[PDB]
Amino acid sequence: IPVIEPSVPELVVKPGATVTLRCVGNGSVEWDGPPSPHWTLYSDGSSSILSTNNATFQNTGTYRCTEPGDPLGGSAAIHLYVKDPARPWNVLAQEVVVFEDQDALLPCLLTDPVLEAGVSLVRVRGRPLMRHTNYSFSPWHGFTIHRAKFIQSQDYQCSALMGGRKVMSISIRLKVQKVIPGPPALTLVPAELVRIRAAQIVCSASSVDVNFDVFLQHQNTKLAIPQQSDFHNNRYQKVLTLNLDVDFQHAGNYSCVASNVQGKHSTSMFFRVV
């Protein structure tokens, strides 16, 4: 495992301060951390050095050192705080995407750890968090919304209490996605049919999301049927109803096929004319 000097878990500096992070391994090592300005990098065979003369709030975050080519070597980390009196937040990302019932980390890094007792998570335009929003805060990482829900897909802001006034971070958009298992669930009925030269064929598909197609095709030439669409039991339905008030040219292989961002699904039946 590589070794970082200074051997301290974290540093707290003022804007303008000089910071020098040095890492040493057996083989070549490399630093990763916040995409930030004014960093100079010195590297040779066994060691690598990050250094800046003008440390800024954007430099706030965890700096991790690893030795590539050593497998299972592990990493070493150090956290930098640049306590800008004007800028309490270093936002790493303005967009976050997760699925429902996952934790959602909003990566606003606090630039001064003593502020933690007076921080909160809010929405843009001063609106309050959605009802029953389960969340917690870590200085090194930011706010984590626990077991995220679709309803919580909002634009957020990190609030820091400095001299009475609450100072906001830049907005962070959270996308919570419904866990869509696969292609739309099909129901084509009847499975078998045979008539003398009336009949009914209903192609249906249903998913928790609206963004999905469904088509009924005779053979490989799709038919133009207006689809009835309704939302029930927290699910979207899309039904193609074919009415033949029949003949030999109507017989054949009716395939009911529905697609979405997941993929395409298909079910089919046979229609005979005697």
């Binding site: 609106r127 609206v210 939302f231 979207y236 899309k238």
Partner: protein, 141 residues
Amino acid sequence: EVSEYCSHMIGSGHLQSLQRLIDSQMETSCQITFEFVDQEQLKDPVCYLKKAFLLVQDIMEDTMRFRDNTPNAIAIVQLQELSLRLKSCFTKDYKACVRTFYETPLQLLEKVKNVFNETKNLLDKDWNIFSKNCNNSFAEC
């Protein structure tokens, strides 16, 4: 992200939930104050709904509050999820051009129901209607 699935999105089930919610409300003379789009400044049907849809979001959070796990509360949640889905169908650029109201809760509910209902109607005619720039419309305010 606008798509051909802007229709089929506002189902009749949504409108039923609203109606049931409306039908459950006690008929009282009390008035509540709320912010909503002025029909006078926006006679344009397409640009009226555009401005209204944004405001309905704040209405459902601030005003339309119900006891947890009640049928109406669940209905509201669904309408809110619906509104998230209805996003990316409405194109928008830079508040205001609106007026304060003082109406009964039932009248507020009728406004919101009308917003959802007429939006469904228009999207059925054409799903790409609300992708027009109303910055020019928002000027005459």
